[PDB]
């Protein structure tokens, strides 16, 4: 049971709908792998910090509070989860 993919699992039309909510009229073609790279570079840091909290707490599952504190260190604070 080893996963090795689904970074491509983010489809093309989903990024289109995110651009439409963003207020975008006309998109090039070269944007998509750029956007996937930006997304993965974003996620890596938060995952490192949540793993660090969980490892210090001596547990095996990841709660929501750990994600909240990891976001809180970044300056991007989230409301609505405790």
């Amino acid at each position: 049971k080893v996963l090795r993919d689904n970074i491509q699992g983010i489809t093309k039309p989903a990024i289109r709908r995110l651009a439409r909510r963003g207020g975008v009229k006309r998109i090039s073609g070269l944007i998509y792998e750029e956007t996937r790279g930006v997304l993965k570079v974003f996620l890596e840091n938060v995952i490192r910090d949540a793993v660090t909290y969980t490892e210090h707490a001596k547990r095996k599952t990841v709660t929501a509070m750990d994600v909240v504190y990891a976001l809180k260190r970044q300056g991007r604070t989230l409301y609505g989860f405790g």
Partner: protein, 97 residues
């Protein structure tokens, strides 16, 4: 044989997607992506579903803000179409890199 001119359907898409509030990415591929890049720092982890939802919310909000600033850049360069150099310029000026 009825066909619209290009852009009109895009504008009404913009209207209804700014009207609605929900998630825009299917949950299982995002979940498998999270487990994939979580595998490397430590093996055999478990996840409350709420944490996955929180990650999805934060990432989607971040991307929307990035697209807004990119669109401002592309309007300033007197175009309509968005380029990856505009994305690079926005991430340069914001100070993330």
């Amino acid at each position: 044989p009825h066909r619209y001119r290009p852009g009109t359907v895009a504008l009404r898409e913009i209207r209804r997607y700014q009207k609605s509030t929900e998630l825009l990415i299917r949950k299982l591929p995002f979940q498998r992506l999270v487990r994939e890049i979580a595998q490397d720092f430590k093996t055999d982890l478990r996840f409350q579903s709420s944490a996955v939802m929180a990650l999805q919310e934060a990432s989607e909000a971040y991307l929307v803000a990035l697209f807004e600033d990119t669109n401002l850049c592309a309007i300033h360069a007197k175009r309509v179409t968005i380029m990856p150099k505009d994305i690079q310029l926005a991430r340069r000026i914001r100070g993330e890199r």
